UniProtKB/Swiss-Prot annotation, chain A:
The lineage of its organism: Eukaryota, Metazoa, Chordata, Craniata, Vertebrata. This is DNA-directed RNA polymerase II subunit RPB2. Catalytic core component of RNA polymerase II (Pol II), a DNA-dependent RNA polymerase which synthesizes mRNA precursors and many functional non-coding RNAs using the four ribonucleoside triphosphates as substrates. Pol II-mediated transcription cycle proceeds through transcription initiation, transcription elongation and transcription termination stages. RNA-dependent RNA polymerase that catalyzes the extension of a non-coding RNA (ncRNA) at the 3'-end using the four ribonucleoside triphosphates as substrates. An internal ncRNA sequence near the 3'-end serves as a template in a single-round Pol II-mediated RNA polymerization reaction. May decrease the stability of ncRNAs that repress Pol II-mediated gene transcription. Belongs to the RNA polymerase beta chain family. It comes from the Eukaryota. It comes from Homo sapiens (Human). It is found in: Nucleus.
From Swiss-Prot, chain C:
This is Transcription initiation factor IIA subunit 1. SUPFAM superfamilies: Transcription factor IIA (TFIIA), alpha-helical domain, Transcription factor IIA (TFIIA), beta-barrel domain. The modification Phosphoserine is found at S53, S58. The gene is GTF2A1. Disulfide bonds: none annotated. The alpha and beta subunits are postranslationally produced from the precursor form by TASP1. The cleavage promotes proteasomal degradation. It comes from Homo sapiens (Human). It is found in: Nucleus. Belongs to the TFIIA subunit 1 family.
UniProtKB/Swiss-Prot annotation, chain D:
The chain holds residues 80 to 316 of 316 of the full protein. The modification Phosphoserine is found at S13. Changing R114E: Inhibits interaction with SSU72. Inhibits interaction with VP16. Inhibits RNA pol II transcription activation induced by VP16 but does not affect basal transcription. Signal peptide: none annotated. Sequence repeats lie at residues 45-121, 139-215. The gene is GTF2B. Its EC number is 2.3.1.48. It is an enzyme of class 2 (transferase). The keyword Nucleotide-binding does not apply. Found in a ternary complex with TATA box-bound TBP. Part of a TFIID-containing RNA polymerase II pre-initiation complex (PIC) that is composed of TBP and at least GTF2A1, GTF2A2, GTF2E1, GTF2E2, GTF2F1, GTF2H2, GTF2H3, GTF2H4, GTF2H5, GTF2B, TCEA1, ERCC2, ERCC3, TAF1, TAF2, TAF3, TAF4, TAF5, TAF6, TAF7, TAF8, TAF9, TAF10, TAF11, TAF12 and TAF13. Associates with TFIID-TFIIA (DA complex) to form TFIID-TFIIA-TFIIB (DAB complex), which is then recognized by RNA polymerase II (Pol II). Found in a RNA polymerase II initiation complex. (Microbial infection) Interacts with HIV-1 Vpr. The TFIIB-type zinc-binding domain is necessary for the interaction and recruitment of RNA polymerase II to the core promoter, the formation of a fully competent pre-initiation complex (PIC) assembly and basal transcription initiation. The C-terminus is necessary and sufficient for interaction with the TATA box-bound TBP complex and for the formation of PIC. This is Transcription initiation factor IIB. One of its GO terms (molecular function) is RNA polymerase II complex binding.
UniProtKB/Swiss-Prot annotation, chain H:
This is TATA-box-binding protein. Transmembrane segments: none annotated. It comes from Homo sapiens (Human). Its main location: nucleus. Binds DNA as monomer. Component of the TFIID basal transcription factor complex, composed of TATA-box-binding protein TBP, and a number of TBP-associated factors (TAFs), including TAF1, TAF2, TAF3, TAF4, TAF5, TAF6, TAF7, TAF8, TAF9, TAF10, TAF11, TAF12 and TAF13. Part of a TFIID-containing RNA polymerase II pre-initiation complex that is composed of TBP and at least GTF2A1, GTF2A2, GTF2E1, GTF2E2, GTF2F1, GTF2H2, GTF2H3, GTF2H4, GTF2H5, GTF2B, TCEA1, ERCC2, ERCC3, TAF1, TAF2, TAF3, TAF4, TAF5, TAF6, TAF7, TAF8, TAF9, TAF10, TAF11, TAF12 and TAF13. (Microbial infection) Interacts with HIV-1 Tat. Belongs to the TBP family. Signal peptide: none annotated. Widely expressed, with levels highest in the testis and ovary. DNA binds at N15, R51, K66, N105, R142. Sequence repeats lie at residues 13-89, 103-180. Disulfide bonds: none annotated. One of its GO terms (biological process) is positive regulation of transcription initiation by RNA polymerase II. The gene is TBP. It is found in: Nucleus.
Length: 147, 99, 113, 237, 49, 98, 88, 185, 48, 120
């Protein structure tokens, strides 16, 4: 899901056309501007948590249980402004980056930190080595998507 | 928009005096002088941004001025046109600017 | 370079309006006479009603129209002012310093009032 | 919660078998129409930078007391909603600068400063002066700095404001100069074009405050800090 | 046309007199010159009520 | 079956069309005034997260505004009693109650 | 993250164009406005109220004084305010 | 025994604002054509901004007859400057008068020549001061007795504004000078 | 309604209150009525 | 339309200045400096534009008015409105009195309660 499903929808055509109004009888109208966006590839970094001071911090799965936090990762996206405007500045490219939100992440995945650690590294961070995953964490409560 | 202010200057008045003499001589029609004067204004406006590249600096003191109908009429006194060759120190100069 | 620049402007206008004289019915010999005649011309108070007590406060208006200055037409770009400092930004103008005609593309100077 | 979702338990998006019904809400408040759109903008604006809910809950309460008095009716709702967040962030202990507020709203800095003096008059509430130690958390972790560098730049700005070394200068520009001094004395050296880019100050702004604290560079350094770079080889800019 | 009133203002005034049992109405169903159904409402002071 | 593939893709697609819809609403005001295109404002970062956290906590499913009657009680609370109680709940199927 | 230009990129550009030519204009001698009506009503009979605002350079509170002098308003069965010249 | 415990250094005013009405309707398009030092932009602000080189002031002739004179030094020069612009209008052939004349704004300036602690002045006098180093480096003071606005900076150059009587400037600064003396660094 | 009758009677200000008064006295007793609006706003809790 | 609206505007505006005499068509194009309009446009607006007007008045060789047919008189507002009651001709709107009679706010208030007002 976090490798092919989040991009198959973007693979189609998220951007849509947008043409400005004509507004005749106002001098030289010629052609109204026409702006168009464009995407590329989705991005998902490590799950981090920001405190009340606005500073990033590693979202520990054990700390989120005592603090009743939601285990999620900041989801990113590549935004590229490929507008045409139908004017004298034809063919121009502008790259941007805007936050879109988070996404629920399941434990024992490929993006979490506690997945390739052995029994010696999991016991140091106060984590049960015999307890697997397969369930989300929503405000500290253990939730699972029953098939 | 055409600028009819250049018709009442040094280059404009000198041409209008020669066209008025041919009217009394019974050689040209009075409706023909309107097309020649309108053509001279369209050809002189396009030559100010193609064959003109040289500039000049000015330095003086402000005296009297007037602004009406988007026309900055400036009348300065004791102005020295700072130029890299021709240096002329005049006592009073009039500057009429438009949009 | 200044006298040569004015010669190209004259030829660009005379040769251009040659077709206009052909539409009305003017012979080509008239155009040659138009250029010849044009070339030669180139070379206290106690009552709140009276106000006459504070007279003689303005200058004479006769020191402007007497044919003593040089008329110069141009266009503005940016007008900046600050107390007594007056900034000026002129461009594309025609000068006339005592008969001799001048031309320029830009004019950025400074003056005080 | 997104839209509204209320009344008509039976509504239940009824549409027989073709989805062609489901009416929409209308003017149910009239006078409170301009107030409903204010709570949605504050909740959305306070989410792009991940802000706690305690500040959001106290920000919405500030707009309720102002709209009830009806003393600032002739003003756009975007300007008042962008000014109530600056008051709630200061009362908690972590104020926010005016730069981050203008970057996520259609209100300039001049409009916020004008409306800030009118809210304190109708509500009568004292304020507090900003500090430099509270701003060394969101700017130090952005450039990937350890705890030793973060604790070193705090002692520099805290000692400079006590002995009066940069009078008249705003603490925003002073906090940016302490980070550049602590970065060059360690292993994570950063230029002035990269530090001032995040804080929002210009390149020549830090240079004016760097020459004032240059003679007092080895004096403002804490005693518990490893001097990776000597103070003699400090570059001047 | 004589009183220079409005279509919605004059109708509200005439309905108050008709509702108070003062005047009545006599509808007519005929044909004008264009060939359409023309309906008139003759209002007169009825002293029988 | 419906696991974490087609089910989570429906929530990621439902709020995706709402994301483009909210940007188009702000884009309609651009052609009316006539300023500069603002992208960092039309992108909402909470409307999508509110629909994903509510559908995975209260057991609801869909978008609440419309589809919410055909899928009720999908997610539940993970019971923590014995080691076999957690494994049995993580590997339990269901049915659309006919 | 993002950049903080101590303002807004969508508002600073508008300030450069707003200060170039402001809508606050003067008016005197109702003659130029009436002369421009012949070049507009010659094509089609009636027009819209919003179309006359873009062509002319007068506010709404002042345009009503001219339209109610040589013209009359009518809904024309489209609810919108439609102005036209007096046929008499 | 003096009023304060120090006194000294009296303020000096440099800006006097005063308005006057003409009481007659005049054509603003004609005055700009007959004048020699006046601006009149109808696309920006409909007013006749006439300036003369004798009082170093600036007139703001409106439409109804109101004229704002700014740039004066004292209260006597402002009254003399307002009468100079009323003579050049009557000379052109306009029945101008001199009615409704009063003092508007009187902006002053002074300097205490010693710095103060702005962190303790805004904290004690919270109901009368407002300082913000992020917005503008300056403590704006407002006393509710003389109706005088003070602008205390970090260097001590206090700029007074909003006044109608010269005695209000000497009274507001006298009751505030010994207060700033106690906050010496 | 008593205030409008005290001043100008008019016609549109009276016929509107009659159609509104019947709406409140109907949904209060018998709320479940097909083909007729109900006393529903924006909360969400079922009205008793 | 536009030409017809310009002729009617100048015909009534000049009358309020201080000229009380009938006018024709050549006088308008001469005083307003619009004589150079052509010969095909001057004759077309003479025997068709001023003829199609149902409210036009031709005395002999000139043209009269059309919004008001009564002469100017001081004691005339009360006498004119009295004829509409004894004969049943209708009424006169406020926009017709303010346009034909200059400054109507003085004659109406001087009569007192002799004229009733209608709120439309």
């Amino acid at each position: 899901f976090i490798q092919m499903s989040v991009q198959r929808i973007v693979e189609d055509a998220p951007p849509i056309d947008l043409q400005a109004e004509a507004q005749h009888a106002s001098g030289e109208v010629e052609e109204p501007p026409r702006y168009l966006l464009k995407f590329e590839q989705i991005y998902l970094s490590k799950p981090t948590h920001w405190e009340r001071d606005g500073a990033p911090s590693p979202m520990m799965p054990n700390e989120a249980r005592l603090r009743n936090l939601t285990y999620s990762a900041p989801l990113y996206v590549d935004i590229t402004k490929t507008v045409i405007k139908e004017g004298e500045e034809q063919l121009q490219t502008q790259h941007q980056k805007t936050f879109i939100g988070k996404i629920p992440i399941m434990l024992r995945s490929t993006y979490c930190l506690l997945n390739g650690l052995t029994d010696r590294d999991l016991c140091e961070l106060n984590e049960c080595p015999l307890d697997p995953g397969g369930y989300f964490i929503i405000n500290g409560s253990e939730k699972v998507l029953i098939a | 928009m055409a600028y009819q202010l250049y018709r009442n200057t040094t280059l404009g008045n000198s041409l209008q005096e020669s066209l008025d003499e041919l009217i009394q001589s019974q050689q040209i029609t009075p409706q023909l002088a309107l097309q020649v004067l309108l053509q001279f204004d369209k050809a002189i406006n396009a030559a100010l941004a193609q064959r003109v590249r040289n500039r000049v600096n000015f330095r003086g003191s402000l005296n009297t001025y007037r602004f009406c109908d988007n026309v900055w009429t400036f009348v300065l006194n004791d102005v020295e046109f700072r130029e890299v060759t021709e240096l002329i120190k005049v006592d009073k100069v009039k500057i009429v600017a438009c949009d | 370079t200044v006298p040569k620049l004015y010669r190209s402007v004259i030829e660009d206008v005379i040769n251009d309006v040659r077709d206009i004289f052909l539409d009305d019915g003017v012979d080509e010999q008239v155009l040659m006479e138009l250029k010849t005649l044009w070339e030669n011309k180139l070379m206290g108070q106690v009552e709140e009603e009276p106000l006459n007590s504070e007279d003689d406060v303005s200058d004479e208006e006769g020191q402007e129209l007497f044919d003593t200055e040089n008329v110069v037409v141009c266009q503005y770009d940016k007008i900046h002012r600050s107390k007594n400092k007056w900034k000026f930004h002129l461009k594309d103008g025609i000068m006339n310093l005592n008969g001799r005609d001048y031309i320029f593309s830009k004019a950025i100077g400074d003056a005080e009032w | 919660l997104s839209t509204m979702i209320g009344k008509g338990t039976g509504a239940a998006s009824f549409d027989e078998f073709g989805n062609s019904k489901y009416q929409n809400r209308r003017t149910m408040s009239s006078s409170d129409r301009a107030m409903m759109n204010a709570f949605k903008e504050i909740t959305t604006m306070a989410d792009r930078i991940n802000l706690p809910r305690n500040i959001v809950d106290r920000t919405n309460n500030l707009f309720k007391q102002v709209y009830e008095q009806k003393s600032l009716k002739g003003r756009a709702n975007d300007a008042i909603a962008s000014a109530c967040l600056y008051i709630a962030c200061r009362q908690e202990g972590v104020p926010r600068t005016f730069k981050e507020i203008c970057a996520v709203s259609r209100i300039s800095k001049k409009e916020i400063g004008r409306c800030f003096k009118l809210i304190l008059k109708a509500l009568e509430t004292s304020v507090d002066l900003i500090t430099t130690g509270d701003f060394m958390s969101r700017f130090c972790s952005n450039l990937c700095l350890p705890k030793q560098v973060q604790m070193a730049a705090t002692h520099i700005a805290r000692k400079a404001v006590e002995l009066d070394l940069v009078p008249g200068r705003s603490p925003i520009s002073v906090a940016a100069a302490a980070i550049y001094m602590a970065s060059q004395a360690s292993a994570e050296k950063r230029t002035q074009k990269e530090i001032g880019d995040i804080a929002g100050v210009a390149d020549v702004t830090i240079r004016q405050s760097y020459r004032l604290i240059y003679p007092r560079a080895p004096d403002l350094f804490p005693t518990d800090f490893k001097f990776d770079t000597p103070v003699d080889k400090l570059p001047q800019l | 046309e004589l009183l220079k009133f409005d279509r919605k203002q004059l109708r509200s005034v005439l309905n108050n007199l008709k509702g108070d049992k003062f005047i009545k109405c006599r509808m007519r169903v005929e044909t004008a010159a264009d060939g359409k159904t023309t309906r008139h409402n003759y209002y007169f002071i009825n002293y029988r009520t | 079956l419906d696991l974490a593939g087609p089910l989570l893709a429906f929530l990621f697609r439902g709020m995706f069309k709402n994301l483009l819809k909210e940007v188009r609403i702000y884009a309609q005001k651009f052609i009316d005034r006539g300023k500069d295109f603002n992208l960092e404002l039309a992108i909402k970062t909470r409307i999508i997260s509110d629909g994903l956290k509510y559908s995975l906590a209260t057991g609801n499913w869909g978008d609440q505004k419309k589809a919410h009657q055909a899928r009720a009680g999908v997610s539940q609370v993970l019971n923590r009693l014995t080691f076999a109680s957690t494994l049995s709940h993580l590997r339990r199927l269901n049915s659309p109650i006919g | 993250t993002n950049y903080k230009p101590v303002a807004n990129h969508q508002y600073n550009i508008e300030y450069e164009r707003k200060k170039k030519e402001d809508g606050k204009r003067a008016r005197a001698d109702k003659q130029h406005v009436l002369d421009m009506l012949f070049s507009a009503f010659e094509k089609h009979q009636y027009y819209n109220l919003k179309d006359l605002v873009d062509i002319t350079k007068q506010p709404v509170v002042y345009l009503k004084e001219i339209l109610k002098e040589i013209g009359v308003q009518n809904v024309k069965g489209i609810h919108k305010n439609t102005w036209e010249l007096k046929p008499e | 025994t003096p009023a304060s415990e120090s006194s000294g250094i009296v303020p000096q005013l440099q800006n006097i604002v005063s308005t006057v009405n003409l009481g007659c309707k005049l054509d603003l398009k004609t005055i700009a054509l007959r004048a020699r030092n006046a601006e009149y932009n109808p696309k920006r602000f409909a007013a006749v901004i006439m300036r003369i080189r004798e009082p170093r002031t600036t007139a703001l002739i409106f439409s109804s007859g109101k004229m704002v004179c700014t740039g004066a030094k004292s209260e006597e020069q402002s009254r003399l400057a307002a009468r100079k612009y009323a003579r050049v209008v009557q000379k052109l052939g306009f029945p101008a008068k001199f009615l409704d004349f009063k003092i508007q704004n009187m902006v002053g300036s002074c300097d205490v020549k010693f710095p103060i602690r702005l962190e303790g002045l805004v904290l004690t006098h919270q109901q009368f001061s407002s300082y913000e180093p992020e917005l503008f480096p300056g403590l704006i003071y407002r006393m509710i007795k003389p109706r005088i606005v003070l602008l205390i900076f970090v260097s001590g150059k206090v700029v007074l504004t909003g006044a109608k009587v010269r005695a209000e400037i000497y009274e507001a600064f006298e009751n505030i000078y010994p207060i700033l003396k106690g906050f010496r660094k | 309604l008593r205030r409008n009758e005290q001043n100008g009677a008019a016609a549109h200000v009276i016929a509107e209150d009659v159609k509104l008064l019947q709406f409140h006295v109907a949904t209060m007793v018998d709320n479940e009525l097909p083909g007729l609006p109900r006393a529903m706003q924006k909360s969400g809790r079922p009205l008793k | 339309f536009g030409v017809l609206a310009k002729i009617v505007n100048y015909m009534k505006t000049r009358h309020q200045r201080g000229d009380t005499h009938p006018l024709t068509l050549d006088e308008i194009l001469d005083e307003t400096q619009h004589l150079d309009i052509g010969l095909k446009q001057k004759q077309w607006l003479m025997t068709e534009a001023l003829v199609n007007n149902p409210k036009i008045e031709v005395i002999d060789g000139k043209y009269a008015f059309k919004p008001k047919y009564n002469v100017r008189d001081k004691k005339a507002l009360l006498r004119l409105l009295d004829q509409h009651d004894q004969r049943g001709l209708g009424g006169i709107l406020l926009e017709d009195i303010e346009e034909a009679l200059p400054n109507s706010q003085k004659a109406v208030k001087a009569l007192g309660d002799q004229i009733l007002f209608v709120n439309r």
